[PDB]
Curated annotation (Swiss-Prot), chain A:
Gene Ontology annotations of biological process type: response to copper ion
Family: Belongs to the CutA family.
Disulfide partners: none
Highest taxon, organism lineage: Bacteria
Complex and partners: Homotrimer.
Record-given protein name: Divalent-cation tolerance protein CutA
Organism in which the protein naturally occurs: Escherichia coli (strain K12)
Predominant cellular place of this UniProt entry's protein: cytoplasm
Entry binding sites for Cu cation: C9, H76, H77
Keyword Calcium among UniProt keywords: no
Curated annotation (Swiss-Prot), chain C:
GO biological process: response to copper ion
HAMAP family: CutA
Molecular function, one GO term: metal ion binding
Keyword Signal annotated: no
Name assigned to this protein: Divalent-cation tolerance protein CutA
Family indicated by similarity: Belongs to the CutA family.
Intracellular or extracellular location(s): Cytoplasm
Record's cofactor remark: Binds 1 copper ion per subunit.
Cofactor or coenzyme needed: Cu cation
Gene name of this polypeptide: cutA
Amino acid sequence: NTASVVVLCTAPDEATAQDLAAKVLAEKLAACATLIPGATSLYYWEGKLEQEYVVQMILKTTVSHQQALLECLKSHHPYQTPELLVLPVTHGDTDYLSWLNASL
Amino acid sequence: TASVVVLCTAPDEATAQDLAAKVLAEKLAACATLIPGATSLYYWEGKLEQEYVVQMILKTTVSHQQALLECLKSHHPYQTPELLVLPVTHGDTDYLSWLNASL
Amino acid sequence: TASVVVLCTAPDEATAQDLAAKVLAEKLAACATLIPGATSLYYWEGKLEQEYVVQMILKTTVSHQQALLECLKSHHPYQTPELLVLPVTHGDTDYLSWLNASLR
């Protein structure tokens, strides 16, 4: 099994979140994705405090696919500099991890 | 002992609620956050599956992850539920002391 | 300049927003995602408590993690709120550059 990782991404709306997930999944760049709607994202954009609706995405993939996934998400995200972060999975259920890998 | 965060996906509220009370009673986790209204997407049989799920986030220590995962797995209705462990590289000393003292 | 995500549990939305808007102004965090509609279960004095909470996910770097936690802790209504730091082992170059450039 290749090492697993968790990818965090935020979409500006549910339609966008929906087809960003469908895409990376179709192209086998992620094993599965969880969408958490009704969130808010605060940050400074050009010296101004912005506050916008976001769908928090959580995608499961492996370290060998993370970059491909990242670029695909970036390529289809409507924003120029979308949130794309990778967190390491230091431990997980063997059967689930095997399934994660099999999916890719 | 170092802390970790555990991600687990539950089919519904009752299940998420059952797994949490369970692992907390067993003292295999210090706390658990539940976030309903989530959507999990994945391919099965070659088609795109979309299900409503409850995202779980459990806090524990490295020495418990094995036990916690086994507990969550056996009590979980699904066959091979999502069970991932993320490392905590740093945290508030007082909150970490509480986490450890609670297990 | 390693990046990290910080998890913080806020009791309500107004509090989560004030904490976010504060750490962002102080430039201790580059972005804060607030996820309402959650609950937290834990034992307190032997009793099982379950409370509504807002899950916060803040983005910063290792250099600022300590100061970010100190600031959050101070303005957090709780005595010892959940403050956990998770490592970001990789991310999109443009996002990371933007994140880093947003910090103090």
